[PDB]
């Protein structure tokens, strides 16, 4: 019997402000934690075509430019779609597809990335309240999900392979130069000048 250490009974009358939720999970407060790959990005901001076109960057490094192009075209985005009835709706370019085997896949455009799920126990999601210095739980993270390219022939995989293969090809640090005179000339001339000023300084100090 490990007796309870705390028996003072002191209690805090702290009241927390909570906001209504736009959605509510049904049947289970379960969520899946998914690691974000390098070739996939999330753009929570609404898609603004004009700033996007005006902010496209061009670099000399072909590998970096190709990687940026791949991540930009593969980035998950969303934008406001004007309905034919005059209303406004949230429109996204990303979907989740479940196959007949029960596996799940993340889809952006025509690209499909498979999901590998590993069950994790005693893993939960919490909401941080920094102003009060306490953590409020949200739900349970039952499964950890990894995103994997569907096949070799997928354009994303081929672009990644090209970028990584040509990235390690460029390696040349030392820069060549042409020597026109003796590399030791500076040292000897500066030593001569230093000895001259040594003699002058010694004479001055003996005369001082």
């Amino acid at each position: 019997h490990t007796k309870s250490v705390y028996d003072n009974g002191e209690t805090l009358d702290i009241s927390l402000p909570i906001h209504p939720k736009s959605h509510i999970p049904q049947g289970k407060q379960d969520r899946w934690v998914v690691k974000l790959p390098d070739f996939l990005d999330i753009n929570a901001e609404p898609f603004d075509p004009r700033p996007f076109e005006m902010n496209v960057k061009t670099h000399e490094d072909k590998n970096q430019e190709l990687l940026d192009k791949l991540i930009a075209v593969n980035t998950v985005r969303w934008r406001y779609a004007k309905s034919e009835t005059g209303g406004i709706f949230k429109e996204t370019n990303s979907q989740i597809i479940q196959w007949e085997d029960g596996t799940y896949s993340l889809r952006v455009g025509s690209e499909i990335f498979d999901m590998f799920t590993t069950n994790t126990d005693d893993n939960y999601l919490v909401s941080e309240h920094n102003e009060e210095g306490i953590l409020m739980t949200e739900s349970t993270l039952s499964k950890s999900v990894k995103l994997v390219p569907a096949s070799f022939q997928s354009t994303t995989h081929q672009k990644l392979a090209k970028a990584l293969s040509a990235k390690q090809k460029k390696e040349s640090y030392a820069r060549s130069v042409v020597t026109k005179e003796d590399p030791e000339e500076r040292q000897r001339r500066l030593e001569s000048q230093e000895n001259e000023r040594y003699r002058l300084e010694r004479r001055r100090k003996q005369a001082e």
């Binding site: 479940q98 007949e100 919490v126 941080e128």
Partner: peptide, 25 residues
């Protein structure tokens, strides 16, 4: 293999203000 079910992928508006941390034992 044919597709069975689909879901739209959207961000959450009411929860971006809060801070979320993955807590594990």
């Amino acid at each position: 293999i044919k597709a069975v079910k689909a879901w739209h992928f959207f961000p959450d508006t009411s929860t971006f203000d809060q801070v979320f941390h993955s807590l594990k034992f």
